[PDB]
Design a binder for this molecule. Structure first.
Ligand SMILES: *[C@@H]1O[C@H](CO)[C@@H](O[C@@H]2O[C@H](CO)[C@@H](O)[C@H](O)[C@H]2NC(C)=O)[C@H](O)[C@H]1NC(C)=O
Ligand SMILES: *[C@@H]1O[C@H](CO)[C@@H](O)[C@H](O)[C@H]1NC(C)=O
Lengths: 400, 400, 400, 400, 400
């Protein structure tokens, strides 16, 4: 209308977008900076980058953009695009975007008394340190640092307002704990003037149902299956096959898991410890299987069983496991022939008795190692899983 | 021509692109917002992003862009590029694009009576929640929220018009159900003025022929092949090999499937349940194979068969399956030699009879477990597949 | 020079870039639109996107950009950059680029009589439907739709000119058949005015030497190798290993092939049919191997061979394959001892004869199944390959 | 200073950036175009794209940008940014970048006598044909075509100057041979005026140490290991396992290699030929192993050895390889019993002799096939490797 | 305020952004260039690209931007955006970004006496040579070259100031050693004037805990497991399976490692040497296993053991390893029958004695090869690992 056109013509008269709009040049300009979190788009553990969708909030008073509503009866607010009025140069310090500024420039809404509002949206990429020590039961704190680039503390007085999470849309992987803020002043090597900044810290908890169902349970099941090599009889040549195939599958699982993790050397991750323990156990099982097979296929003429191993294996472990322990000239010529045949048969029987003793010793060793390996696997798995903090509360919140 | 040049010169006189074109400054400006869907370019389940190709539709009346056709006989419409006339600042709220605005700015067509048209095209990326609970038989609702950024309800009266799908090009993977719209007003923490918005919801159904042919059928076939381990005779040492290789292939299949799914913890997907059931069944089959091999390679001197297992296995299950149950001094010296030989042979025969009994018991156990595992596999597969809603209608629409 | 400077100063006087340059405002402006294909950069089967490098061609007459060559003796043509003269707003409708316009804006060459030329280059991404039903023997038609966005049929009369392929650079994977064009008018829900457009269709044929050498031949070789399981004697426990390892390799091959194909449900691809047939054949071979091993390791005391299977296997199939079918008190005491020994030996001989008969039956079954499986594999492979159209001409053009 | 400010004010007076700066409008303007190669950033065999870092060089004389140094004692050169003076519109024709122009616009340095210099840097992506016929011993020629877009031969006289490689930084994978240039004129369907262009051809040689160490050597080693199947005795059932596992590893190697190569059908690559030959050899080895196992596990009652194969295998090949060729009523009743026992033993001995003969024939066949396969593998590998040109010089330059 | 507005109006009067702000046109302008490192975002070994987050520092005196503070009591500094005042055109020479300039343009802070400050941030991608000869124990020097593009040494006197690392944020993978700088002048083929530049070299050390835990340790464990093939008895056909499966796993590990390394031919990496040595050792182990199996399954009728191998194997190696070395007419008719039976048994015993001797020789060979292979593996691993420089200090800093 006529009043709106006249007001727009009058307001921009003699207006300089380069000038800080303060009545007194010696006084700082107060700007209220806040934030409005809308969504956590992505958390990149490998690249250490957090992607969020937020709305920035800025507010200040303009001394020159004031008018009397009586003279312009219908006009209450005006809007100015980029490059026509003064705006703060507030940037995100720890940006990880190929172009530093990610905000989308929009209009600035103005009171009839000079109050200005500026709420630019955008997709913000920031570089925050991600700790994988307790993965997948980890809680991450990622910081967002904002502040004016070229305005010091004597010119632009930055103030903080609490972040808004009313329109937050929950994520299926991360659980938001809170987003507190802090305002502080710092000194830089450039200049002798303090530069205030506002830092917002996003605290998020990882939901562990997916990882527990897709990584931890299959590893437990395969490790338990690797213990079946101690129930197979040695007469079936299928023990090394079982052990080695299980080991190969677990190595594949290590590779799949490590393809998603950062190559940091700060600490050893919990899942890395778990995989190392499982693989060491499986390798020891393969070694024990080799020893048991060596005992089973023992040549009777190779050598007598040592007294110590014989007594311990055939008495103490047998008692402990309640093992069952098995166990005219023509006439003379024919006589010596049948005597030779009978003696040969008796020697064969003695050799088979020795072989049976060796096989029983192998079975006893195998059963003992089964018990020991099962106990060790259970203890190691439980201890490694329970070592992590907030594991119990993660289980309670996710599964129960 | 002369008339066109004169009209273009006259129209831009005293025109301010910052001013809302209303005759009365106290009245809202009515803008009709609609949509025109052209193609569903991509649906990203892992990143929760929907990519579509749409044309926006805007329409409003400009009070200053009016002229009499008699004075300009040949001129009926005029066009203005970006930055020369007022346009609404309508944006997509839930944008997932690195730059917030994705529209391509084009000309604005104007009546001889002030009516304006604006139809910018673009490739729009939006973040919509994708539910994989019933994958691959899922139906997705993705919302597109539009609204003016800096104009309230007292300034810009946003109205809704039904979306146009006349030029829609069908997608080979997703089946469009409909795109209804809804207009609503909301309050924001910024201001005390309502801000209307228009939301369009895209309902799409996944076509399941590809997934059924590439994932579900091979898993069924491999699981059925895993049941062949109960038909192999134990004398051939090739049962553990079959079982473990099938298990390894199925684990590879899990990894391939999980590489395409989001890491959400909202619920357990149907395909995840199916894979878990199949893998548990195969592992139990391997355990049963170990037990059967243990029974088959039984030492006759190890211990007598327990009475309970002997009677049950050799009577009840045999009846149930109609199993066939198998079954001068020189003369004295020669006499004792041949007596010893005959006694040795008789003892060997008795031992072989005991071994045959053990082998028959192993065969009976193996057949019983074959029947039980087959029934269980069929029941679990059918139940898991039928649990999903609209599974029957998906099958009817895709395969039949 | 002086004349060039004077002409440039005079031409831009009173010139409005917003005005359509026609002497009569009531008449349409004729614009000739053509195309110049230079290269087919990429064809994306998974994303349904075609990337090409083309030069657009536009031509029209400007009424205001005319001068007499006599007054400017050396000046014959002038050039104007973007934003200084009127240009048509011709766009690609089915664009798949994140920014809708992909042309690079260049100068406009002008006659001394007003004729204008505009040839912007660019890399164009368009969304065209790609049919994988006959892959890898498929021929694709991808359409490129061009037209003015905001100029109707009463203002801009779009005309078509045949595309130029003189500078086309052949691609090593796709064979160009032709690029015809078509001009048509359409009505839109926006307005009551027809909007002409020019559509160019690119017909391309896939060169199949690479795919035939890298996919089809290895599958044939591995499937043929899977038939070797019927030549291995059953005494060597290495049949299940062969069959299952071949099956695992073929499954890996399925995964590799499916990683490059779209997840469409329009139809079942030819290569998918081929893989399904091969895998079904291999699985049936494994089942037959299990049955043969069951027959070979038959307990003689298990049960007599059924009469029907005995007669058929030992007579009819043996004839068909010309199979070779194998086949004082002390004296009394010693007498009964040796009688017992001889009777035991005779019983052993009878049992071994029964076992030999069972083994021969297993061999006959194995040979029969070898013949049947070989014939079936050959027939299925040949039929599936020959089902595709233009397969013969593809083979002739690529291999021969 | 004052002189610099005055000169800058005076130079831009009446200056038109659209006007070609020539004293005579009828004469062409001479522009010297050269190049300065700095780095070869990437060579994309799969996408047929070359990425380089170069500096363009342009030079021309401006008639209007001249002044007397005496009047401006301290000023010798001036600089003008983009859009303030005339510049040639020289573009790269065969660009593969999503935006056609990749140069970074910088200042233009000007003499006191009008000579202008323009050296824009940039990262240039160009589409050049890459031939993989002799990979990894290939030499590639990639062309870079430059020329003015809208200036013909009667307006802009493009001249060529030799490229500069003084600041070239060597690449660890490609060896630069040279970069010659050529200037030529072409006619286009647009217009009846020739358009000169300058083409630079980059000749590069691939350094083959990495590929030879990572691809060729492991394949040779695994193929040689596959020949160990002819040294394993048949009594150990571990021949099919060796052969099939080697075949599976080689197939994995094919997949890894083919994941990096273009899907072109121009010709069959050398590495593809090598892999095909190795795989055919391994498959033939598996077939021979099946035949040898069939011979070894021969039933003595199956049938007499054919005379021809018997004589050839047991005489000619044995001689050739110097093979060692192995090799009262009660009394009557007891008499017939022991006669029966002895006759049974004699028949068993005869059967075992026949089996030994069959086993020796199998061993002879196995040794013969070992020799033949070793010779064939060596010959094929050497011939395929030596077929490629410049293979000897590549080996000499890389390894020695 | 009024003073700020008046000063801003007065300062821009007659100001030309194209003019170098020096009082005397014949004198160079001194510019101080420094750097401020904030983070090392990424180091790309495969693409030879380093990504860092730095702040540039520039400082110079402007002769025209001076004023008296008394006349403007409250104003002490002013800020000017891009394109309104003169700025140096300092660029990064070895940029690897698709657009050459990566800095984000910000305001320029100005003294009341003319001193100017300019600190643009940005994400910088540079192409630096990365040496993988000692990977994963490598130290990398990557250079960042800065300098004015179009200003020579007679116009812009570039000076260097030491880099600032106060706000550096440590990286979890790379350890910063230091960032020294160097200023030098160079001549270019363009012109006869020297062009100074400032080069900063970033020295970084890789933290090796992650790589040592994920690559080196599993390889050592698997190589040690491959030595178990010399403890398995030959009677269990599970030696070739163990060896070949270990070899296949190691080949997979090679592929995983090589997927992350550049394809350079400068030198052979340490990890490549380690993998080659391990694979050669495993292959030799497989060959030795084949030989041992050949000795074990020796036909007694094949041929007498050669005297030399017999004496050496059964005496010298047995002594060295303390190996245990095992070891009326009717009456006449019955007489010859039992004589024949006894002679057959004696011949069988002699054959079994010969076979036992061969088996013992095989065991001796196997034990000898076990010892030799273990020693060789240990020596090769230790030597290859210790060959790298700073390996000891890397271990001390990371693990201890
Ligand atoms: C103008 O720039 C060019 C090169 O920078 C110079 O002109 C050359 O001067 C040399 C002698 O010094 C001649 O041999 C060449 O023939 C000239 N080149 C051309 C294309 O003519 C010259 O230094 C500069 N002119 C002034 C006044 O500085
Ligand atoms: C320009 O060149 C032509 C011949 O090429 C000549 O006739 C004409 O006189 C020249 N113009 C001037 C002003 O000298």
């Amino acid at each position: 209308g006529e009043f709106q056109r006249k007001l727009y013509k009058e307001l921009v008269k003699n207006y300089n977008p380069l000038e800080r709009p303060v009545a007194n040049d010696s006084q700082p300009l107060t700007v209220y900076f806040s934030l409005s979190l809308l969504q956590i788009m992505d958390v990149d553990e490998k690249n250490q980058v957090l992607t969020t969708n937020i709305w920035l909030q800025m507010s200040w008073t303009d001394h020159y953009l004031q008018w009397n509503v009586s003279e312009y009866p219908g006009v209450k607010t005006v809007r100015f695009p980029d490059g026509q009025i003064w705006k703060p140069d507030i940037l995100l310090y720890n940006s990880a975007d190929e172009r530093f500024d990610a905000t989308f420039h929009t209009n600035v809404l103005v009171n009839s008394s000079g109050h200005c509002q500026y709420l630019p949206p955008g997709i913000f990429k920031s570089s925050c340190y991600i700790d994988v020590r307790w993965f997948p039961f980890d809680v991450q704190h990622c910081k967002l640092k904002f502040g004016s680039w070229s305005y010091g503390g004597w010119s632009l007085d930055l103030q903080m307002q609490e972040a808004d999470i009313s329109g937050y849309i929950p994520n299926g992987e991360w659980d938001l704990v809170g987003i507190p803020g802090k305002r502080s002043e710092r000194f830089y090597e450039c200049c002798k003037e303090p530069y205030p900044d506002v830092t917002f810290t996003v605290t998020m908890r990882r939901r562990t149902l997916y990882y527990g169902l897709n990584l931890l349970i299959p590893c437990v099941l395969i490790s338990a299956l690797a213990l079946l090599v101690f129930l197979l009889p040695a007469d079936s040549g299928e023990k090394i096959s079982l052990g080695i195939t299980v080991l190969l599958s677990l190595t594949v699982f290590m590779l799949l898991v490590a393809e998603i993790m950062p190559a940091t050397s700060d600490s050893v991750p919990l899942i890395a410890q778990y995989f190392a323990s499982t693989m060491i156990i499986v390798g020891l099982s393969v070694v024990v299987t080799v020893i048991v097979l060596q005992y089973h296929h023992h040549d009777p003429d190779g050598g007598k069983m040592p007294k110590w191993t014989r007594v311990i294996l055939l008495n103490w472990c047998a008692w402990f496991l309640r093992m069952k322990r098995p166990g005219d000239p023509d006439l003379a010529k024919i006589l010596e022939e049948v005597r030779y045949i009978a003696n040969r048969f008796r020697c064969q029987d003695e050799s088979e008795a020795v072989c049976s003793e060796w096989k029983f010793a192998a079975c006893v060793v195998d059963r003992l190692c089964l018990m020991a390996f099962s106990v060790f696997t259970i203890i190691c798995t439980i201890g490694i899983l329970m070592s992590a903090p907030n594991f119990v509360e993660a289980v309670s919140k996710d599964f129960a």
